[PDB]
Amino acid sequence: MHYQPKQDLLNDRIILVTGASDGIGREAAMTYARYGATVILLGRNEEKLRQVASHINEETGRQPQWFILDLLTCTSENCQQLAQRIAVNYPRLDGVLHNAGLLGDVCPMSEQNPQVWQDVMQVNVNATFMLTQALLPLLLKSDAGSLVFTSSSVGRQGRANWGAYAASKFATEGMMQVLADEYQQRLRVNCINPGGTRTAMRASAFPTEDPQKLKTPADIMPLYLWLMGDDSRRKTGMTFDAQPGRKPGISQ
Amino acid sequence: MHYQPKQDLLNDRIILVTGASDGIGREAAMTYARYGATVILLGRNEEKLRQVASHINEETGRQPQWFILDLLTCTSENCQQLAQRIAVNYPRLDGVLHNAGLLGDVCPMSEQNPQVWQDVMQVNVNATFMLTQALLPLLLKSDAGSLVFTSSSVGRQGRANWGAYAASKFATEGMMQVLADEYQQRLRVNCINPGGTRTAMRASAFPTEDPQKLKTPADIMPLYLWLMGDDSRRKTGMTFDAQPGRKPGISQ
Ligand SMILES: NC(=O)c1ccc[n+]([C@@H]2O[C@H](COP(=O)([O-])OP(=O)(O)OC[C@H]3O[C@@H](n4cnc5c(N)ncnc54)[C@H](OP(=O)(O)O)[C@@H]3O)[C@@H](O)[C@H]2O)c1
Ligand SMILES: NC(=O)c1ccc[n+]([C@@H]2O[C@H](COP(=O)([O-])OP(=O)(O)OC[C@H]3O[C@@H](n4cnc5c(N)ncnc54)[C@H](OP(=O)(O)O)[C@@H]3O)[C@@H](O)[C@H]2O)c1
Predict the structure, then answer these.
(1) d(CA A241, CA B4)
(2) Are the beta carbons of A170 and B168 separated by less than 8 Å?
(3) How many other C-beta atoms can be found within 10 angstroms of the C-beta atom of residue B205?
(4) Cβ-Cβ contacts under 8 Å, A112 against chain B
(5) Which phi-psi region, left, alpha or beta, contains residue B201 (left: φ > 0; alpha: ψ -120 to 50)?
(6) What CATH superfamily is the domain B1-252?
(7) Domain regions of chain A by residue span
(8) Cβ contact A64:A34 at 8 Å
């Protein structure tokens, strides 16, 4: 998506980003900030969140708040305590970008490791679900709350060596549609499939690949920017692609 | 699907059916038997499996073997011990129908109960995955092993009150496609979405509904029969509907 907006586009918007410590999440949080947003960072590692908060401070003069939450093991209650902690400092939430993710094994189903498989379901689906349940209220208390999940090409068509991850992204799509058709004109709820992007995790699943050939988290930010502003205030229940017509695979 | 075959159609086929104690699983197991198959019953409750085995005995003179396996709590190893127990008594497996399922809460995401949500993921996806991993070998040792999963209309498009269940069925579809494109010409791997059928579980999610209005597990057996015989030996990676053009909803 080509999309060129005012650096005040998100001026009075409170937006929580998961997986904000790295890759696309770090990028999205920094970009939201740079466009006015009052961003909240979520991750497991505090030092990594300190780093990110500090850079947003350098870039914008306001320092974002971070909260720690480990999706692999957090409980429903853990998620409610979080929402409560948030609630004191913020009147509401205008946006939630679910970006935290676990890849897990890329390998044949025969070799796919079950603990890892389950770890992937837990982070990508279950905890992602529980956190969105704990955050649903704060969001509903927005002029027009925007909720986006992170999908993938193997969340629309499963390919040979993808495993827990393909299954988890399908579930993400499903989960988005149930929420979308359920919050009819109360919230926007969509997925973005970012596409192959230059991050450590794309490296890990494609070591052959030359990252210089890949597009960059900054390169795909337009879509992220769109789904969060007002230019999208009527669109819900959809799955947007960041690199339309890049098509599956490695070389590119 | 209209499909009228020899009652020797599955004559020398070994077929394992999960959720064989009730509903569509009980039906499929009894129908396979009645068409020649050497059927293996899986479930959690032994007495309920005794009942079913005994009726197949009345109907066909051969008594099927049952094995107990509780998908909510079984471990990877639990699944391997099973496959081993099977392996002694059977040279291979010509078919595996994954039919065991958990509905979980039908209600808004806001009210969706997390333990139940996770229980549904565990049975429908995770354990279904681990059991198919433990059974993959026996299956590959077949002339043409057939593996089918059980999907649902909310595994293709998520609807308001479906929850863990919609998400789990999407994942099922994903899991089927990864396996299908991965066992290229080595196995057939498809889903059947049975459609609204007259079972206790359809009753539970649609109490308004009049079951007399519903089609019956025996009424949709053609598709089950198809996917398992030779008349389908080249089709893989697909999602077949039992009641094509019934369309979502209650009244019907
Ligand atoms: N980039 C691509 O090629 C592409 C393609 C398909 C899908 N995606 C999707 O893009 C999203 C973001 O990917 P990325 O490449 O930006 O990520 P990344 O930098 O490689 O790492 C993903 C993020 O997830 C977080 N995370 C993992 N486990 C967590 C846990 N248990 N608790 C809390 N946070 C956890 C990590 O935090 P920590 O640093 O603290 O560990 C990390 O910041 C993912 O959901 C992925 O599925 C991207
Ligand atoms: N019928 C429909 O309207 C329709 C529509 C959509 C989807 N489906 C699909 O149809 C499939 C079969 O449904 P049905 O109506 O035939 O089923 P059902 O009779 O209502 O019960 C489903 C079966 O799953 C088994 N099961 C549940 N939890 C288990 C566990 N933890 N361990 C082992 N087995 C377990 C049950 O065994 P026990 O008796 O021992 O508890 C039962 O035999 C399901 O996968 C469902 O998703 C059907």
Answers:
(1) 45
(2) no
(3) 16
(4) 129, 133
(5) alpha
(6) NAD(P)-binding Rossmann-like Domain (3.40.50.720)
(7) 1-252
(8) no
